[PDB]
Amino acid sequence: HQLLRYLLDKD
Amino acid sequence: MELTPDQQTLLHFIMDSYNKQRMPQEITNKILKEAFSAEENFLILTEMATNHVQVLVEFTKKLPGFQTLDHEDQIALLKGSAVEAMFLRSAEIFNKKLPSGHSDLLEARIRNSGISDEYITPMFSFYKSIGELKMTQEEYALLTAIVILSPDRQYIKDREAVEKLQEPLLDVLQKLCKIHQPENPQHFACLLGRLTELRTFNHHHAEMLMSWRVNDHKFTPLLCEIWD
Ligand SMILES: Cc1cccc(C)c1Nc1c(-c2c(F)cccc2F)nc2cccc(C)n12
């Protein structure tokens, strides 16, 4: 989950 | 005969976001310099794969209506569509973005990275099959959006909301086929053939990752744990 969550939620 | 102003707007938004995707020259230049060994060849593929992941997320976030979806559904779509969108973009890189010399060396590297022919043969077969379609940049962008906005991915809580985002894209794609290929009414059908061909890579890719053991140079936890 971790990586895809970071990339989506970052600006 | 003509896209409606609303369809033109949707197409413009998809095209603008797609045209901004780029595989950097820093990655591309490695194809012509690095040692021709399984380890160095695989390191290039690792760099390409991470760029594919970053590009997929940036393209997805900009898709009209994607930001209006339930946050968990946004993640479920990214996870579910990752392999298919990566394979589709890798075909565009190989067939259109790289000069003949770079693509010939990239193929050389792919074939000498220690990956079984069981997974390499279907990949180049797909690259050839999609290459036959002479797909425009509009077709690549719409097909990518359609793959990402697939409502039947595992663990989506509101499928109908995804369907409302995917259906206008399929409508625009079919209209574009009627406009650009009026003598060829089987063109949209040919584009649908690539969607099912992309689906077969979900299992091929999962089997590929499982075939590489923990101590092998190919085991790459950053990418492999996206699916583990
Ligand atoms: C760029 C590339 C080209 C041919 C074969 C491979 C294995 C790659 N790179 C990877 C892909 C991948 C991709 F990025 C695009 C298309 C199809 C893919 F198998 N998936 C993964 C997952 C873990 C590690 C790597 C190196 N990897």
Residue of B nearest to A8 (CA): B57
Q: Which residue of A has its CA nearest to B226?
A: A1
Cβ pairs bridging A and B (under 8 Å): 24
DSSP 3-state of A10 = coil
Is there a contact between B106 and B98 (Cβ–Cβ < 8 Å)? yes
Shortest CA gap A10–chain B (Å): 10
DSSP state of A7: H
Gap from A6 CA to chain B (nearest CA, Å): 10
- Interface test mutation site (partner A, options B67, B78, B81, max chain A beta carbons within 10 A): B78
- Helix, strand, or coil (residue A8): helix
B104: Cβ contacts below 8 Å, ≥ 6 apart: none
Which residue in the block uniquely carries the two structure tokens 């990239």? B106
Q: How was this structure determined?
A: X-ray
Cα gap B81→A9, rounded to integer Å: 18
Q: Of the candidates A1, A2, A4, which has its C-beta nearest B57's C-beta?
A: A4
* B75·A3 Cβ contact <8 A: no
**Resolution to 1 decimal, in Å?**
2.0
What HEC string does chain B produce?
A: CCCCHHHHHHHHHHHHHHHCCCCCHHHHHHCCCCCCCHHHHHHHHHHHHHHHHHHHHHHHHCCCCHHHCCHHHHHHHHHHHHHHHHHHHHHHHHHHHCCHHHHHHHHHHHCCCCCCHHHHHHHHHHHHHHHCCCCCHHHHHHHHHHHHCCCCCCCCCCHHHHHHHHHHHHHHHHHHHHHHCCCCCCHHHHHHHHHHHHHCHHHHHHHHHHHCCCCCCCCCHHHHCCCC
Could you list the residues of B known to form a binding site for chenodeoxycholate, using ranges.
Answer: 89, 119, 127, 205
Chain A residues with CB-CB distance to B226 below 8 A: 3-4
Instruction: Note whether A2 contacts B225, CB cutoff 8 Å.
Output: yes
- Domain B1-228 CATH (choose: 3.40.50.300, 3.90.1310.10, 1.10.565.10, 1.10.10.1100): 1.10.565.10
